[PDB]
Amino acid sequence: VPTLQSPTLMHSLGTLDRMVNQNMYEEVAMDFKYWDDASDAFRPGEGSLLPLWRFVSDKSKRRQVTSVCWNPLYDDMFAVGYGSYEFLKQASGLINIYSLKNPSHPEYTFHTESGVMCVHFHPEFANLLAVGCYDGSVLVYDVRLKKDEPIYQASVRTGKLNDPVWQIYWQPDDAQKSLQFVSISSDGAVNLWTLTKSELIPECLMKLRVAAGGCCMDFCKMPGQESIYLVGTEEGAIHRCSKAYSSQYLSTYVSHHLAVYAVHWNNIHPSMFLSASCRLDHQAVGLCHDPKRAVMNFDLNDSIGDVSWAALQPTVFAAVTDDGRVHVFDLAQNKLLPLCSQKVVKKAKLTKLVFNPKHPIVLVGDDKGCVTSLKLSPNLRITSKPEKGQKFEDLEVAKLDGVVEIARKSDA
Amino acid sequence: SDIESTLTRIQGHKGVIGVIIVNNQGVPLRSTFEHDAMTKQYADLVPGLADLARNLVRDLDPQNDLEFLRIRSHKHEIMVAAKDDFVLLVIQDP
Amino acid sequence: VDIAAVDETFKRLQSHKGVLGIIVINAEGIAIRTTFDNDLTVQYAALVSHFTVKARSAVRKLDGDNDLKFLRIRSKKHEIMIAPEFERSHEYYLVVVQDPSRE
Amino acid sequence: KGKVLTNGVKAIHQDFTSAVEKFQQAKQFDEDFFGFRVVIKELERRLAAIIIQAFDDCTTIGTTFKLLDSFELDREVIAHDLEKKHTDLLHSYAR
Amino acid sequence: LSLLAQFQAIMQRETLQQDLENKYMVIFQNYAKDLDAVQKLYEKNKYEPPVPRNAPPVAGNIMWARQLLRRIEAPMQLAQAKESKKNIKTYNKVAKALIEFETLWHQAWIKSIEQCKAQLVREAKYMQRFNIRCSSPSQMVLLQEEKFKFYHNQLTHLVREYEHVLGRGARPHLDDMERKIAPLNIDGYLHRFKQGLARLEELVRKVVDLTE
Amino acid sequence: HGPIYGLRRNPFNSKYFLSIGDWTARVWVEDTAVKTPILTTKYHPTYLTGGTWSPSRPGVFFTIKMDGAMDVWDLYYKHNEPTLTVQVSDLALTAFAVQESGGTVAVGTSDGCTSVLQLSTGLSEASPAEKANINAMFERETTREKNLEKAIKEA
Amino acid sequence: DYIRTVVQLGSSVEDLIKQNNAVDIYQEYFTNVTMDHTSEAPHVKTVTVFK
C-alpha cells in the first residue's frame, strides 16, 4: 500500500528499461533480423561473420565463459556459465541469464561458489536449469521464483561425482513421478540423477575403464533415439555406448592422441558425427559401421575449443580454436579448407561455440569472461529448398552422402 | 532493494536525462533533477496525454486498454508508462 | 504515374507482418485513402485528429524549438502508429495499426 | 524397481529369439557363427548390468536368492563379474 | 603428399614413375616451412607455454612440447641430397631442444615432489597419472588417493552441517561438540563427529516442535 | 519370526495383509500358493513391536521399535530403508493408532504418557492402481520360484 | 506535394514497423506458469502430548 514499493511498479519499470535499452541498440538488432550480406553473391567461395551484441557484467571479467545453452520456447535466452579452466586460477563460478531484449543488464543471475563447468535448460517445461560444478555438486535452479538460491543440491550423502562435472543433460521423463539427468566426470564415470522429494539421487550408468577409471570430458546424445550416446575420454579415444552396459563401447572410434574436447551429431543423416580435440585437428566420422578410420581430417594451427554442426543444414559446420579466429567450414563448397576464418577477439583465447535453432546467429565465448554474438553471411547458410515431390531431410542426407563417397574413394 | 537499483541503472545510460514518477492527481514524487523548475512542467502536462490516449484506445472496443506510450520529438523520446496508480515518465534522446 | 507509387507504398507497408491497417487523414479530420470500412474509419479520423493536435501542442509548449515526427500508442491488442509531418500546404498524419501476434 | 528391469530382461529375450530365428536358415557358417558369438558375449552384458542394478536393492540376506536364483547361467563370462558380489554378500552378512 | 600418392597410384609409364620421385623436393620445401613455424613456437614460448585445459603446470607443459615434436616428426617418416643435409641438420637441432624441455622439466618435477609432498598436495600426487603414461615415476606413488578425497569430502560436509543446526539456535549444548570438533587416526574422529551431530540434530528439532 | 506382534489387512483397494511383528517388516499375501512374503522389507535393529497401514493412502506403513520410531515407510518409491525415521521418545514405544481420515498418529511410551503426532500432505494420493499392481506382480515371481524346485528335482 | 508527403511518411513508418518486428520488447517471460516444483519433505508435529 505504499505505492513506491508496489510490485507492479517494478514490473512496469523493468519493461520501460527494456524499452529504453532497445532505443540504444537499434542498428545492432535491426541487422540481427533484417539484413543479408550483399557482397556474397559475388564471391562464391568465402563468407564473413558480422559481429553483433556484446554481453559483459562486471563480475565476469575475472571469470572465463565455461558453457552456453539456449531455452526451448522463447528464443531470446542464454545461459552463460562463467567459471574457471586454469589449474592455478580457481575461482567461485557464476551464472547469469541474459536476454536479447536487454543486452546490458541480465534478467536473472546467481552466484555459486565453484566453477560452473556446464549448464542445461529443461526442454519441455522451459525454466528449470540444471548445472554442475568443479567439486561434483550438481545443482538444479528454478528461475521464476526470483530467489537467488538453488532448489536442490548434491551432497556427499546422496551422491557426488567427486571431480569436475563437465557435461550434464536432461532426459524427457513422460508425465511420470520424476525428471531425469545424465552426467559425466573425471574420476569414475557416467551417473544418473532423479528429482525426488527434496533431493537428487545417483544411479550409476557405466564406468569408463581403460591405472584408474580413464578421465573423460564431454558427451552428446543422438536426437532421433535416446539410448545411444558418444563420450570423450582423456586417454585419447572416442567411445560410443547405449544406456546399458550393453556391449560396453558399442563403438570405439579410436583415432586420437590427447584430450578430445567436443563431439556433435547433426540432426540430419543420423549416422554421421564429427569430433574435435586438443591435437589441433577435427575429424568428421561415420558411425553405423566405420570404426577404424575417418572419412576426413582438417588440420589446423591451434587446438580446438569446440565444434558445432549447424542447426539448419548438415553440410556447414563451425569450429573454434585457441587463437581468436572462429573458422567455419562448408563441407560441400570448399573441400579441405575453411570457407570463412575470421578473428573476432583481440587478446583472449576463444572457448565456446553454440548455434541458434531459429534465427541464424551464433554465440562464441572468450577466455576473459565475455560472450560475443556473430551473424552468418548467406553463403554460410544455404538450405536446399524443398519442392513438390521431395522431402527436406532427404536432399540434405544426399549432399552429405555424396561428399562422403567422393572423399572415401578419393582418400584411398 | 530492487526499485532504486533499477532507477540507478536506468538513469545512467547514454541518453537519459530524467526519470519522473507522478501520482494520480499530481505530486511528482521521486524525480531526478538538479532543479525543479521543469519537473512540475512534466507532471502537469503529460498525464493529460496518457489518459487522453487511454480514451482513444479504449473507445474502439471496450475489452481494450492502454499500457504504454511514446512521443518522439526531434530531440527527445518521452516514454510514459501510465497505469491505474500513477503515471511514470522517462526522457531520453537516442 | 505516382498514384501507382503511393498505392505501391500501401502494399509495401501492408506486406509486413501483422499490419492490420493503413489510413491517411488530413488536418480536417477526413480520411482520404482507407483500408477499413467506413465507420471505424471516421471514428479513427476524429479521435486521432484531436489526440495528435493535443500532443503536438504539449510538446511545443514543453520546449519552444522542438516538434514531433512520431507517435506510438499501445494496446494489449494492437500498437497504433501515428506519423504527422506538420507543414503548410500539407500536414498528413498517416496512421498505421499493427501487431506482431498474427500470422 | 523391477518394472523397468523386467522390461529389460524382456528386451534380452526378444533379441535372443530374433537372433536365433534369423539363424534358422557348408564352411561359411563359421562367419555367422562368430556373429552369433558376438551377440552372445554382447547380450550377456545386459544381464550383468540388470543384475548390478538389482543387487543393491536386494533388501536382506535372502532377497538375493530370489534374484540370484531367478536366473541360475554359469559361464566363464558371468563368473568374473560375480566373485566380487558374492564377496559383497559375505560382507553384508557380516555387517 | 596424399595427392602425390594418388597420382602414383593412377597410371603407369616408366618415365612418369621416374618423374614422381622428383616432386618430393617440392614437397620438402613446405615441410621445411613447417619446420620453420614450429621452430618459432619453440623459442617464443619456452618458459611460459600455453597448455591443455585443466592441466597442471609442470607436466602439462611437457604435452605442449611433445605436441610440437610429434607434429614435426610424423611427416618425417614419410618424406625420407644436399638440401636434405641442411634440412636434416635444422631438424636435428629442433629435436634436441624438444627433448631439452622434456628432460629438464621432469628434473624440476623431481625436486618439487620433494618440496610439496610435505592445496597443492594434489599436484605432487595428481601428476603421477600424467607422468605414468610415458616417463618414469618417483618415490611413494599415488597409492594413497583412495582415502584422501574421501577425507576431504566427508569433512567439508559434517563441518558444513555444523552451521545449519547452529542456524536453529537462538549453552552446554554446543559445549559437547566444540570439545569433539577440535581434537592415521582421522578415522575415529569422523566416527565421533558423525555420531556427535546426529544427537544434536535430534535435540534441536525436538526443541523447535515443542517451542512453536 | 519369533513372537509376532503385527497383523493388518490392507485397505483402500484390495486384500493383502501385513506382518510387522518381529524385527522384520514384511508384506504378505493370501493365496494357497504364496506361503511366503511379497515385499519383504529391511532386517532392522531394535526388535519390532507394532504398526499398521494408512486408510487414506495406499500402502505406507509405520513401524515402532524398542527404541521408538514412526518410520513413515512410503512403499512405492523406496524399498530398503525407512523413508522417515522420527524418534518420538527415548523410551520404548508400545502402541499405534491412525485417525480415520489419516494424518494423526498416537503412541504411548514405555512409561506413561501418550504422544499425538501430525503428518502433512505426504498423506494423500493421485493413483491407486499401480500400487495394487506392484503388490500383485511381485509374488508371481514367488510362485515362479515354486515351479523351479519341481523342475530342478525332475531334471 | 501530397504524394511526396505520403511516400516520405511511408518510408519512415516502414522503418518503424521493422523496428517492432525485430525483437518484441513488450513481452514478459513466464507471464503465467502455474506448475511449480517445490520442497515436500515429511513434517512431524506433536500437537499436544496427552498426559
Curated annotation (Swiss-Prot), chain A:
GO cellular component: cytoplasm; dynein complex; microtubule; motile cilium
Primary location group: cytoplasm
Domain of life according to the entry: Eukaryota
WD repeat segments: 111-151, 160-203, 299-339, 345-384
Stretches of the chain forming a coiled coil according to its record: none
Cellular localisation: Cytoplasm, Cytoskeleton, Flagellum axoneme
Keywords, in A-Z order: Cell projection, Cilium, Cytoplasm, Cytoskeleton, Dynein, Flagellum, Microtubule, Motor protein, Repeat, WD repeat
Family affiliation: Belongs to the dynein intermediate chain family.
Subunit and interaction comment: Consists of at least 3 heavy chains (alpha, beta and gamma), 2 intermediate chains and 8 light chains.
Protein function: Is essential for arm assembly or attachment to the outer doublet microtubule.
Full protein name: Dynein, 78 kDa intermediate chain, flagellar outer arm
UniProt source species: Chlamydomonas reinhardtii
Gene name of the record: ODA9
Residues shown, of full length: 248 to 675 of 683
From Swiss-Prot, chain E:
Lineage top rank: taxon: Eukaryota
Annotated signal sequence range: none
Subcellular location: Cell projection, Cilium, Flagellum; Cytoplasm, Cytoskeleton, Flagellum axoneme
Task of the protein: Force generating protein of eukaryotic cilia and flagella. Produces force towards the minus ends of microtubules. Dynein has ATPase activity; the force-producing power stroke is thought to occur on release of ADP.
UniProt domain comment: Dynein heavy chains probably consist of an N-terminal stem (which binds cargo and interacts with other dynein components), and the head or motor domain. The motor contains six tandemly-linked AAA domains in the head, which form a ring. A stalk-like structure (formed by two of the coiled coil domains) protrudes between AAA 4 and AAA 5 and terminates in a microtubule-binding site. A seventh domain may also contribute to this ring; it is not clear whether the N-terminus or the C-terminus forms this extra domain.
Family according to the record: Belongs to the dynein heavy chain family.
Subunit structure: Consists of at least 3 heavy chains (alpha, beta and gamma), 2 intermediate chains and 8 light chains.
Name the record gives this protein: Dynein gamma chain, flagellar outer arm
Organism encoding this protein: Chlamydomonas reinhardtii (Chlamydomonas smithii)
First-to-last residue of the parent protein present: 517 to 774 of 4485
Swiss-Prot record, chain G:
Localization (cell): Cytoplasm, Cytoskeleton, Flagellum axoneme
Superkingdom classification of source: Eukaryota
Described function: May play a role in regulating dynein heavy chain (DHC) activity. May function in holding IC78 to the DHC, or in stabilizing the entire dynein complex.
Family, as annotated: Belongs to the dynein intermediate chain family.
Subunit: Consists of at least 3 heavy chains (alpha, beta and gamma), 2 intermediate chains and 8 light chains.
Name of the protein this chain belongs to: Dynein, 70 kDa intermediate chain, flagellar outer arm
UniProt source species: Chlamydomonas reinhardtii
Phylogenetic lineage: Eukaryota, Viridiplantae, Chlorophyta, core chlorophytes, Chlorophyceae
